Amino acid sequence: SGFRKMAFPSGKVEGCMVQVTCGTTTLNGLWLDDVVYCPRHVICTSEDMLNPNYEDLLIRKSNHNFLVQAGNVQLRVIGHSMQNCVLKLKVDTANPKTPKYKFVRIQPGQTFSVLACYNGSPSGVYQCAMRPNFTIKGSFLNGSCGSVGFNIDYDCVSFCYMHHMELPTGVHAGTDLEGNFYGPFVDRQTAQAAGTDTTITVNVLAWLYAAVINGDRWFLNRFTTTLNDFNLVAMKYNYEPLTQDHVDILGPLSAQTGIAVLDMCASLKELLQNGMNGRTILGSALLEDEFTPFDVVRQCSGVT
Amino acid sequence: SGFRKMAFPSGKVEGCMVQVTCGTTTLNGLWLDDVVYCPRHVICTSEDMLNPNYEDLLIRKSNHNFLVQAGNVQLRVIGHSMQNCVLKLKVDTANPKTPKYKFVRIQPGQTFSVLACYNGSPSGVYQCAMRPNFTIKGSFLNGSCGSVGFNIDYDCVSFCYMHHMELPTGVHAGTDLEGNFYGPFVDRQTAQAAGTDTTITVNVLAWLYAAVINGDRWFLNRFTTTLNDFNLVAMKYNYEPLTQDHVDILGPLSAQTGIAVLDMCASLKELLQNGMNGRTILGSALLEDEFTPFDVVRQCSGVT
Ligand SMILES: *CC(=O)N1CCN(Cc2cccc3ccccc23)CC1
Ligand SMILES: *CC(=O)N1CCN(Cc2cccc3ccccc23)CC1
Questions:
Q1: Is the CB of A165 under 6 A from ligand 1?
Q2: Core vs surface per residue B36-54: b (16+ CB within 10 A) or e
Q3: CA-closest candidate to residue B197, choices B126, B135, B114, B140
Q4: Which chain B residues are closer than 8 Å to A144 by Cβ?
Q5: Which domains does chain A possess?
Q6: Alpha carbon separation from B96 to B31, B42, B269 (Å, rounded)
């Protein structure tokens, strides 16, 4: 019992983290097989950041200008290319610690583990969600970019995130491992506002299921509601619209607690309309939306 | 910027996790050098758990009755001893992945990373604190015991916790790596209530410092207070008494924010007396007490 914001074990990803230096800029790279992936803004001076022409900047750069360090051993760079907003540095050595991996582009509402790194050294690990506005609420200092987000399915690491940006509102933007930004964000020092940060309704409901399973049931009520009726209250409170897909995805949690999804929707409505009245649910004073139904099943069943 | 409940990278500890089976009971063990540490209740049938005589139970057991599996390879057990509430199984092979390590007994209020395991396989990692009542608020299912808590100082892993118990109130009790329980808890199926779960005042203040550093400053006020005056309000709200040691430990955070510790105490008093009024601090609706001053410094400075 007990329910905690849990990251995947970071071991497999620690073995992939290197330091990448281009001139006076050091950040993190991901070393898989004989390629090192890093943010392309590694080639920039902070002056370049106001309006960088990455193609023109990159012409001035040679293989030997990319200093790649794995632990305290230097890797030899034999090739370099730009793919969207990432550089791929070809090294002459395959990472012997390369795990089975995939690059996946995640959907908003989906959760991943971040291994925060500085100078290719891991400092810690936390669980994130891709926000509906394609931002993440990270912990990222200068030197932290090239830090990655991942899921692990048993022995396969699916890389979903590379860290690139902090927005002047202190939230975080980045790319998938093919270098395409989540959201409308660009690797340039320009006015960029995050959109409305809406709540991942299906994740709140999952976390209400997790609460019930873990004995916190005070918020359960005598009421039910409808998708249309529930969604009127969601709208008012900047919650994502709930769909039959979401309801289907909650089915297993429904089945195990024997609480219909729409009854839990009615509980959630009362929580939105009435607040918590100073009470807590799994030790939280607000509604947690960064556990997926899949996350809840995993943590409440002990999947390794 | 941004501030997250961060665990240490779990890599070094993943390489130490094995499965331990005694008859029909499988839990996790920690493999360091040529010793495997596990909870001694591995030798129990759930019938034994009502009033186990561990010495008498252990006489019936031989080296060959302790099945130790590291990944999918069996370790040969050449010795077995009980130290307090842990077994030490001597194996003929030193763990080649043994990191530099220490066993430390932590103080209440101190924080550690947990690597939750099932059948010697890591499922995830989360950050805990030792509560003033010597419980932790974990996520632990059946098979999770022998899962460990740790800190990492650069390359040295200090093991502080091994998981043993869930209390009927769904909080968690366990031992240091010398097998001594934190708190008055015993590895027996008996009436055992956790004491008052008081708030780690120095950790709340640290987390208020972390908030200020990360731009969340609404709760800052025009007031100050005194240790004695602040502690009257702490008492009323089941907060730990604040001492000059605590104030000294906050000094660096004081220095960096230029907010005197006693001014922040006055902010905390107003938060206790007045509540949050529906506002949030670092995305939390209650006062977080599971970051230490040391944790805040680390995360707001990027220590690897
Ligand atoms: C990524 C990291 O660790 N830091 C933040 C980004 N910075 C370079 C950079 C990249 C994109 C946009 C942007 C805007 C303003 C300033 C800097 C920027 C490197 C360090
Ligand atoms: C540790 C774990 O994964 N589980 C919980 C503990 N249980 C055996 C055990 C140990 C101490 C007390 C106690 C009390 C009641 C029932 C079982 C108990 C093994 C599984």
A1: yes
A2: bbbbbbbbbeeebeeebeb
A3: B135
A4: 302
A5: 1-14+100-197 (2.40.10.10), 15-99 (2.40.10.10), 198-301 (1.10.1840.10)
A6: 10, 25, 52
A41 among known catalytic residues? yes
Tokens representing B14 are 């993943």
CA angle B238, B241, B138 (to 5 degrees): 55
Residue B264 alpha carbon to ligand 2 centre in Å: 42
Please identify every residue of B annotated as catalytic.
Answer: 41, 145
Residues of A in contact with B285 (CB under 8 A): 276, 284-286
Query: Could you identify the atom of ligand 1 that is nearest to the CA of residue A188?
Result: 12
Determine the number of helices (DSSP H) and then strands (DSSP E) in chain B: 7, 13
Strand partners, A151: A158
Residues 6+ apart with CB under 8 A from B256: B209, B213, B300
Residues of A in contact with B140 (CB under 8 A): 1-2
* Resolution reading in Å: 2.1
Q: Which of B147, B101, B125, B110 has the alpha carbon at shortest distance from A124?
A: B125
CA of A209 to the centre of ligand 1 (A): 39
**Method by which the model was determined:** X-ray
Ligand 2, atom 14, residue with closest C-alpha: B189
Whether the CB of A49 sits within 6 Å of ligand 1: yes
For residue A240, the 8-state DSSP code is: P
